[PDB]
RNA sequence: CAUUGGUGAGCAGCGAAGGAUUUGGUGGAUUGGGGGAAUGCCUUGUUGA
């Protein structure tokens, strides 16, 4: 529907809170993490971006499952059987209830709903790829047990399903639908269950910190573990020979407990945010001492046991809160800097791996109001200036080392940092305080170099030309400050009707647009020191606006859900993009290809595609709520007879001229009376006011090959009648040479003079 | 300027080893090179795309049936997808390893990969966009084999697979699991290694060849089996089949060898049409026309970089050279023509703006160190290490003189006067510069004034002052046409290799003994000194040039980029060349002021000044609508229509508002235009003139505009000199074209009176 | 032989095998031109044409005679033409191995160019241009 | 006479309940000539079986 951009992809998503799946990849494993209406498939040992869902679901996926080479996605009444991200099959359950948990064993599919009804599916053949046929329906009445917590299956339990409830544990014979075992009423509500690699024993983690080692054959406890003040969220067992216990908590802590020696080994302290659920799923590797933890904080972590406390191995994560301010880190369109209000500092890759890395602050830094980035001085010194909320200093950063700088930048006027800027050469930083002072520092040595004070209110945007000559500024007292960078002279100032909130500057055209409080966009030519453009139509405040790299477009993002493309050669709005999740940041790529938009909801970054293969479009607003090759070809260094007889009776040589001008260098063709009608074609060709460049060729080849046939040794025959019809308009064609003598002679004179 | 500067063309067609393929149209030529990918046409050769994501040096390219799906394959073995204009719509990481064979389906539906020791079939999507993490979906796999697939043939049905591998077996696979003839029948019985297997399009004949030049044809019969059609036993060729291809006419074979020849064969007769040997350098790749009219073949990097087009009736259609690395460039007095200097000892002529190589000159005993013209155009010159320096003509084919007379093996630098009267040459190890006459070649006086070796020789447009840079921390000024010599200035730092001059005789730039670049006047007052060279993959200052507009300089070292500066202190741009393993050795500017030069091991030439980027010359949006106000100014007020038209920079507007107005209004508008709207349209009109066929049209424009302010543009030179060049080249090129046909049509009627 | 490799500290034995063939190219060429009658001006001129090249090549440092072509042409004359061998002679360096390591970590500048190749060959006349860093 | 080299003591300022210096492993990203025969060989002829 949009006339420039198309929704392209979202970068910055790892997890959402759904417990991950794990499956077999030959000998290693794969991990299925959820995004929402999308999921992601990763390596176990190396965590490479392997696969993704090729098509979005109608709603968010509730439960994830991983069979040997298959991924089973649970939503509204449908489960997608996928392989390698590709939809191989889709079951629709015969209900309107919502699917909660799944279980797969032998030849079975277990599909639990929120109405305590489970649909059991069976394979037609045991060598089939998947169950597809409705076998039976079981219903759990309230007199049989509580609400179903999970669906599990222990060792040696053929045709028997473990359905754990809030009140008791149920054991079914799914070949018959019979409940072969019911357990007693349990005092504590069960939140987490886990299969054991030992026979007939299931773990039952309660709502409080109690682990119930529960026998399934006899139906009794042997052991329970009392944890003071914890809600058990995830449980996993070390299956490399050592019998241990991991206890996920809602706090984000992970409790390492030893089973045989009866001791608490360790606890990981707040590796996931308790506000985002804490540890949603924690799973050891089968035969390896590596546990992988997930949370609702857009991250996943990995931990190893070095043969002992665990060791932090590697992790892949993003911002836990939706992004606030971003910047393209390179013109090669590979890296970016992203900063959100979760006090995190991430830097993203844009290639097929799409990897990420959080910047090193080496308890977080306060959240960020402004960014300043360049690409000329990576590795040589610091290249990032960050403006934090409620701080009187700025923080420098190195993109090369991914590590914080050595220089904090005090405003020296008792005011908070409100606008940061950098020079294109990467030498000087420009900061504008909340009191109005703008200091120039040296990015190599961190020194005070220069200080200005003209604004009496907070400085909201600072820039400089790429020639490092004229420095522009905008303040809340309506002031637009024009400085010389070489001197300290006030070159100019302009006063507007509204205070200015942001300054974005186009360097290679020396224009800068300004978001004002009067809902207008003031684009300014800097060399004139003149307000030149102003844009109207935005009903609400604009927070993000950026220049097209060719300087022709400005797409802006406003609070009234308007993302409008603005064409500068006409000064009007040519496109408006009306969304439901409004973009907090719109950022033009250095190449003319992509767009970086961060939104209100969603921790990832939607990238938008300008098609850029064509356009001539100009439609409007508000909607839904050669020439030398032939003459060079003339010299040689080493049918149509219908048409001449049709033109023999009439004026029909435009078609023959079309065949000659189409193809066929006709020195060989015109060799195979008729030449009189050819001269008739020459006069009709001279009748038009075009193609005389071909006419010169035709008359020339007429002289060359058949000039003896023209000669005929006794002239003034009927040939000289048609030639007499030729020379008189040849004299009309003799005018053109003196014009060329004028042009070449005057150009030669001014060449001399 | 403020333009984007990049290569939409290059220097040299094929410098590294690559494949070869035509288009489906037959009027386009796909000519790859080892590092990047460029697409050509038949007439008016232009570099179309630039696919560069390679870190290893090989490339494979083919289109499906309509030329919109284009790939390249390096040794890394991943896929890039561009439409027509190097967009990189899809960046599909395919593998870590390379691929031996790869082929589309002829219906454009399926896709064929041969790697490892297996077979991989992938989905071919239509004309679309990105948004795909994996746009390629597996259709089928076919397993197993014994080892890696060496060659591949398909079917017109797109359901049959006839292939061969290193295991001397021609295996068979069904595409859509149809099991065509229910078998995977391998064809064997070969005495030597099978180089090529090709399936005939009649569904009847089975073509096989082995490396001994023996051809075996088998039948489509699966008593009831595939029997023999024909056998061969050649033991007299003593060669190896390097490349083999089959014709769509299904009648001929074209065989390329390691021996440096190319042999023609007929399939039912098994006869030699003709063999063509041109040397010992082998033919690497070969491509066939889709109807088989023209015959082209690729060759190795160590062999020939020379690819020749051919026919079925044995005559060459297109020839090309491009031997080893470029040492220097030289701009023609019209600038459209480009000569090359190389290590071989040859100088080659290249109108590479249209791709053509007309001729060359070859009299050298050793390599060439520099090339330079004379602005008269009558003569160009050779600066080589041959022991002499010889003079040359354009199209008359005569070495005028070889200038020498002392024992010398190394002639490094050179300078001439603009009059062409005297030529001075700087000897490297000998501390003497030698003058030579245009009359006979006389050595009148010898100039022993040096204590270090010379490094640059540059003469001014003022034509009174010779500038020289030597390797002794001393800059040298000289006068010949007066009565004496001038006291040479003393530099502060820096033995100088690279020197640059203004064509006014006032501004002079020196490269220091490091990455600092300092410029100064004729009164030796230093204007700028530019900071050292960055960019680790130690300092270089090897080449420098003062731009012809007089507002910029271009700096070149050898750290794989190029640097841009203006007359004030600052950097204009820095353009880095992305390449894996010195780069720059000669920099000068174009006389038409559209690009500049760069001599390298690779060879890359143009800098692409563009107009699609929006500019604001004279506050454009005071003229509010760019269309309706113009449509108002096409009825009335033709003076303001052009003043409004210059403030815009949309060429789809410029041709129409420039076209619409009548003839009589043209001298009036030429009379009343301001002088600040002038140089860009007088610059643009010369490049715009060469394309269109409205010559009398622009002719009446440039007579009035040229007659309008001749004294002012005579007062405002160094810009209207360049625009003057850009129009004068069009003037003489059309002029010599139309005068000849004017006289050859003129004499006819008097000859009619004769006899 | 073996100690000549040890004294000159050559990286490869095949590098010794290269220059023996390069000497062997000269030596049979020294033979065939010597197998001529003495009255030939072709013979007398072209011996001098070969000698005058090899002076500036640095193989014949001093001025030599006709019979020294059979004599003075050795592999070791080529082995002295290497870069660190020349470097040790003019006494800006200190040992043989010290001349090696400065080319290794890059402290030698020959004229305007930086050179770090260990197999660099030095002529008789270009040797004035080796500068420090 | 030179806050001249080294050594050691003390004070101002800067921080305050620790600071400074070094090293190891693990994890990720990124890269041949000249002569020669009795004698061996090659090639050709020859002798009979």
The gist of it:
Chain A is mainly beta.
Descriptive report:
The structure is cut from a larger assembly and holds chains A (753 residues), B (755 residues) and C (133 residues). Chain A is mostly beta strands. Chain A has eight helices and 56 strands. Chain A is 11% helix and 44% strand. Chain B has 755 residues and is of the alpha+beta class. In chain B, 13% of the residues lie in helices and 28% in strands. In chain B, the strands form 13 sheets. Chain B has a four-stranded antiparallel β-sheet with strand order 6-7-8-9, with no helix packed on it. A four-stranded antiparallel β-sheet of chain B has the order 13-14-15-16, with no helix packed on it. A four-stranded antiparallel β-sheet of chain B has the order 17-18-19-20, with no helix packed on it. In chain B, strand 29 and strand 30 form a beta hairpin. With 133 residues, chain C is mainly alpha-helical. Helices cover 53% and strands 5% of the residues of chain C. Chain C contains seven helices and three strands; from the N terminus they run H-H-H-H-H-H-H-E-E-E. In chain C, helix 6 crosses helix 7. Chain C is elongated and about 55 Å long. The interface between B and C is small, with 5 and 3 residues. The structure holds one RNA strand of 49 nucleotides. Chain B: Its main location: nucleus.
Name the descriptors.
part of a larger assembly, 3 chains, A: 753 residues, mainly beta, 4-stranded antiparallel beta sheet, 56 strands, flat, B: 755 residues, alpha+beta, 9 helices, 13% helix, globular, RNA-binding
Physical arrangement of strands within the biggest beta sheet of chain B: 6-7-8-9
Largest sheet: number of strands, sense, barrel closure of chain B: 4 strands, antiparallel
Note the overall shape of chain A: flat
Chains forming the largest contact: A-B, 69 and 62 residues
Counting DSSP E segments of at least 2 residues, the number of strands of chain A comes to 56
Number of helices of chain B: 9
Q: What oligomeric assembly is this protein in?
A: part of a larger assembly
Please compute the radius of gyration of chain A using only Cα atoms: 39 Å
Sketch the major β-sheet of chain A.
4 strands, antiparallel
Termini separation of chain A comes to 60 Å
Beta-sheet strand percentage of chain A?
A: 35-45%
